[model samples]
Target chain A: NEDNARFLLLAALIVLYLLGGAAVFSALELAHERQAKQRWEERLAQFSRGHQLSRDELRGFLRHYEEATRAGIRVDNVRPRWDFTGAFYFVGTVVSTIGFGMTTPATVGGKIFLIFYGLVGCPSTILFFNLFLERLITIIAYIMKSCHQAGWKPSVYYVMLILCTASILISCCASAMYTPIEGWSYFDSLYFCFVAFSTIGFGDLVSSQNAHYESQGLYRFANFVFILMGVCCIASLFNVISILIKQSLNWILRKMD
Target chain B: NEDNARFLLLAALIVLYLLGGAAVFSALELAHERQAKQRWEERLAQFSRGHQLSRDELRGFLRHYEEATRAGIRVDNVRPRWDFTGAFYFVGTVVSTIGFGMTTPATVGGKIFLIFYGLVGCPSTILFFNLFLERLITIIAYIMKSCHQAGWKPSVYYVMLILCTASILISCCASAMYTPIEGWSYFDSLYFCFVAFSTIGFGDLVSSQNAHYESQGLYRFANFVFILMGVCCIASLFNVISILIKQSLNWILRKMD
Candidate 1:
């Protein structure tokens, strides 16, 4: 009975932590993005002031900037379509950086920019997620401390039980969804999700050869967004589980009252 | 003269801090590695004692472990190799993550693993090099701080002098090295390095041809190492220069003593 109660408390704390961390990091990212935009605006203003360019010249500059952003020749062909299941699997593969080399963008500039873009972008995303995870865990820590003050179990085992259960359940749902969409066996989908959430990105199975997804812009866009969200959740789940396990072990060993 | 001496001393203090951080991190990594090895040994001892395996079984187990370490497929055969110049250019492309998809490893597993492997490995190598560069700057900082403590005209200016000279020389060498090897015009190579080192990774110009490298193994390996080292140094230079610039600006604003 005591262990069960402790487990529930742990689950509640984990959820609270996740929510809090996400909020904090989201705030920080928004702040940084604002600052970056302001700097760019200032640069643009300075450029405009320095040169009294004719309308044609201004248009030319705007065109150049647009071209620069779209430097890679855009290939509108090969839009991949995925149902909810396919979407889930695709998201798992891409976010984990497994890429699989099965279906990649065909253009030169696209691949090149992706390499450098991902270098900074991936780490930044990871950092942001980490910050969120830390914030969440800290909240859980505070709650656990409060529970201890109230003469509760005060052991990390409870926390691990909660996290493990939640991760397993969420992982099951994610896998179930992916198996149908990617047309893979349930185990393969699970394996892909497991590797991806861990950030190991083994990339054995990837999203490719989907006759359904091709030429469906809305479906493809939705797939992108869903994968982004699913990956974020899976990653957060792993973080919670690892933290719980470590804390549980430490609590048992140290016997913190 | 006194001002110069004081500036040198300040620089020395910064260098000390950077080196201290690196040494601490390195020690922690090594210690964790040792701990892992011990745990593995303990597991092996327990397994050996419990199983009473035959010599062949033991050998098989050991071989399995060895193979596990090399689980990922090698795409070396399919990896395009160019002349020394082309090789150098290719190294730059990989380091900068402008990995053009045109010439890639044929095996699915190899390519999939390459994405995350490079993601982690490249950044790690860059970071290690950055630490080394930090130690170098720390040594320089100590000298600058000492010069400041001696009452010089202005210490920040002298530090800037050192940084500017170093940055220009390093940039020049990087540009020269890339141009001859990759068959790119001087300006193009310089531009490539600039955008690459800056973490832009445009991926427009990639090393696609698999040229027969002289002493292929040694040459390619050396190029890889050189590019990694060069990138770290270049990145470190950029950071130090930025700090110096910021300090100079701050000193002007506050009228530093």
Candidate 2:
């Protein structure tokens, strides 16, 4: 009964959280959506009138485009997404649990491959990244240990502070790189880095997708290293943050019971 | 030197993992892509011929459609996605980090809110699910303990097997629910369930966005419950799986050293 009560409370809190977030999102985005839809309709009408195209004809093509796009093909994007390098990137996103939906599997075979491949690859990749993170933090811990005064005692916070700052620095540097290469605005680049590192990977703004790709091996390598370092730092940072959150959660639950 | 050597080996292994995965994906999906692309080109030609529309005109409309689609808007879908319920669903995906990207934030405010909100909400939600999982597994452990022979001691494998079986059972039931509602095939529904539970969330086949949505409160609730339970079970399963993987990884590392 006691556990049931806790479950009910946790469930209730989650709903409250979701509801509050929903309200905020609606308030922020509802008008934007309405405005956006009106503009699209206007543009749609303009194209229809100017070209003498029937709504049905336009709809058919739109449907085809949508289908092709969902299959990871876009008519306008000349860049190849499902090719070898792109599929490799796709696997990286999938196993990382980013799933950018940029180069998703359209075939039954690919889908089948995705499930089992992800099952094994996700676990292995996570393990590898985590082990790498341990070594990363351990090395940083000692580096900081030597740098600190005799009065300095190492704490989780200190390591967290170091990694947290490192992640931010990497984010800024990543933004600088993407702003020039992807030609995204500064904020958008920063936003992309945040989303990518958090592994939400909205895919609204992806990196290294410019039309010119024959001469960017070094850039791709840099992108890969930055992504790895930033993700590892952020991953470890979340671990530390979650522990802090857990303590606060326990404090609340203690009062609850 | 030893640490450097280990890092180099780990780095090499991950590249090997990614490269092998890329090759497999290319083998599986390359022909599918080529065939699909050819079909798309044929369809595009047919539409261009039938409509008497120039390639330039078609390109303009496609550009418009693609822009709208990326902003979580689609002309054909009459259902409101940025409304209150949809935003709630969006937030759920965001906090869970599944991020189906079906109803992503279009506005700058929404994107800005996304980073900070997810920072707080993801950690809280993760901790909540984990705590609930301990309770869930604890109850199941005792239930199994009472039914077992005295010679049988509880082990993580037994719990892993139990949760693994529970997840598959839940997935099958979820597949049953989604097949009719989403008009997906049985395998597609099951695939959606797996991708959602894995948190890869390709968004190629999302559920519960049918044009008719007036009569599905109970279904939505069931879907929500199934999602929570399955995600928790699978998340815990991966934790157990990772520990096993870690030991094997250790064995490999020992050999390497």
Candidate 3:
């Protein structure tokens, strides 16, 4: 009976976490959207003033503009797709499945190619990531051993702290490097790194967003390395967490029984 | 020596696949982009004619418009951020790590929530997907058993064909259901399902794209279910392929030795 009760309680906590998280996200999105709407309205009003357009005309123009935007017609200058660095970055995203979808193949041929490319690239990337994870695990193990020898208790929680700290350090480095090039605030840069490394890949703040960075082949190449290593780092961390969590959960259940 | 040779050949094949896929995707995107540019130019010309603006004025206006668009100032209609279905869909994507990123929580709170939500939700989703995979594998095994009992020697290739066919059938069903509602061509719908199930999630084509469909809670719920099941279906198929491929590689290396 206790075991069953414990199981139910655990399940409830999980559901609560999901629902609570969703509620928070919804609220946050709404607040951001409200600010965005206000900004757009302000811009529309300024444009109307500049053009000396009547209210009806302004309304119609705004309507048209909104429709065009929704349809994905770019009103601004974008990087040339043919650029070598940009193309390379695109391929990296595709293979990693971090596909920001900000820039995608628009042609049938491109789409067809992506289908096959993804088929082979996805598994190959996973294999490479696993290889990286193996090496990272070795380093992590070494750290744990050193800590143990130095009279520190290397618990799962301790290991988790180290993994998280390493992840943050990596993100901090990335944020510093990207801020000037991407013109994003430090927080935004950090957020982007976190998102990309986690493989959530919101694509809202990808590296090389600026057209000026398109030709920086070395810089682009560096970003690729960062992503590859960062993803593996997180994956290794997650793997450790998974093992620890499963063991803890089992222990708890056993105690309850 | 033979093991090393086999490994090298596998590595070569993986690299060739990446390059070939990249080339194809690049070509396709280039062609599509060319047409898009032409269409935009034509629209600009028509708008210029209607406004009766001088070439200089038109150029200035176009420049401003382009800048705004690149900056992601959407002028058109979009679903409300707080809508139940939208939030649910966002949660689904977040946990799955598919993260279409077509819509994201813009506020700091939402972003923070997403981080934690993903931390818990990702594993929970993976656990759920594994459960689904287990059930799916059972069905697949049953099918294989029946085939064997019919006195046909079923090879790994035969099992692959069945798995692939089953996946295609699922995609086809999804394509048919989504085509009219999303106003996508059959091929596009299939492509969306394929991309989504693979968890590549380019976010170029997402469900609930239509504002009218956004409020249909039941339809959105159905879509959520479809995605959960679909992802598992593909994952199960991939798992089978992985197992078979590993065996085949081992056999080949033995033969070579």
Candidate 4:
């Protein structure tokens, strides 16, 4: 009966979480649009105030501005496809399906290579991730035993909390590093890290988009390392959470029986 | 010994496939860009010839046009976030990590929601996909058994090839459906499906971008159904390929021992 109650509570929490998420996203997007509109309007007002142009000319300029903004030309140019380091990053993202879409293969050869690359690389990448995760789990188990021997018997909840916090902290630090370089707000940088680590890459904010960062081969390599390790950490967290969910579900079912 | 040889051969084939795929994708994108550039130039030439505008005005207009073209404003607008069905699709894509980046949450709340949504939804979506695959594999096994009983012995390679082909064909049919509505070339549509099903989600070409499709609620629902089924099919194909790869790897390791 207690297990059943707990299961019901968890189910309720999930439902509440989804509803809250939807509401939050809806509000955030609305505010973002409003701010963007205001900025655009102010820019238009300044243009109008500064220039002595006919209504037709003004309309044409505004139309162009709108078009430019929508097309993403107003912010920054996309990373060039020929840059080897950038291209390498693109390939990694493609295989991982964390396709940032900040820089994409525009050339015929690049597109063809992407398909072939994904076909071979995606599976191998998955294998690599699995191997990494297996090793990580072993390490964690060893740590847990060491703690137990030292008389520090941490609960699963506490261990998971630490892991979850550590991952977030890592993302936060990465965000801090990216903000000044990419000209993103701290929140935006953090959001980008979260989005990328979650593998729900929006491509709106990518590290490679920072032209300065992309030019450095060492920086590019570091970026790759960070992404790989970050993703692995997230995957490990997911695994732990999944196991907890499964155990809880089993317990509930047993109670029901 | 033959099995080990086969394994190596398969590995080589996968490498070749990746290279070939990259080449094809590169060619396609290059051709696309070339055509786009040519069209833009022709349009600019025509505008210059037709207009009696000052040189400065012409330059401004041309700059705007170039920006617009780069940003993808010539075809259609990205999907709006406020639409319930569109939002639902967005949420689904996020959890699946098939982030097409066609439409993203622009507001702070939306971004925050996205983080939480991904946290809970990714695991559930994976669970769903796994369950679907398990059921599908069972059905496939049953069919194979029936075929075996009917005196038609099929190799694992043969079965896997058929499954892979079927998945591609399904994507092809979906592409055909999308092309007329979105006004995309057949190849573009097919490419979109391939990118999405692969979970690369380039977001360069998305079905929801079509205003006509977005307006119809039923159409949006159908689109969700198609994406869900398509992704499941693709995941199933990957599972089969993974099994094959594992067996091949085992064969190779055994030979070494």
**Local distance difference test, each candidate:** 0.44, 0.78, 0.66, 0.63
lDDT, candidate 1, B129-193, per-residue tens: 44455455566776767876723233445545665566556656766765666667765655555
- Candidate 2, DockQ score (0 to 1): 0.65
Which of the two, 1 or 3, has more DockQ?
3
The interface root-mean-square deviations, each candidate in sequence, come to 25.0, 1.8, 4.0, 5.4
Query: In model 2, how well does chain A match by TM-score?
Result: 0.89
Q: How many backbone clashes does candidate 3 have?
A: 7
Over the true interface, candidate 3 deviates by an RMSD, in Å, of: 4.0
RMSD of 4: 6.6
RMSD of each: 25.7, 2.7, 5.2, 6.6
Each prediction's DockQ against the real complex: 0.01, 0.65, 0.37, 0.27
Of 2 and 4, the candidate ranking higher by lDDT: 2
**TM-score computed on alpha carbons, candidate 2:** 0.93
| Positional deviation of residue A128's Cα in model 2 after best superposition, in angstroms | 2.2
Q: List chain A TM-scores, every candidate, in order.
A: 0.43, 0.89, 0.74, 0.69
Residue by residue across A1-257, what tens digits does model 1's lDDT show?
A: 33434344444544453344334333333343345445544644554565443545444533433232222111122222232333333323332343433322223343344334333333334443544445545567778787666343334455546555655676677676556666677766655555444443333344434555545566555544545455555556544444545356347545633
Q: Candidate 1 chain B: minimum summed lDDT over ten consecutive residues — where?
A: B68-77
Worst 10 residues of 4 chain B by lDDT: B67-76
lDDT of 2 at A201: 71
TM-score, structure 4 vs. true: 0.74
Q: Name the candidate that leads on lDDT.
A: 2
lDDT of 2 by residue, B1-257 (tens): 65566567766877888899998888888787788778888998987888677888677768888777665566456468668888888898898888777777766777788888987787777777777777876777677777763334457787778878898899998888788766679988878899999888777777777667667788788888899888888888888787787776568878966
Ranking by TM-score: 2, 3, 4, 1
Candidate 3 global lDDT = 0.66
In terms of DockQ, which candidate is strongest? 2
Second chain only: TM-score per model? 0.43, 0.90, 0.75, 0.66
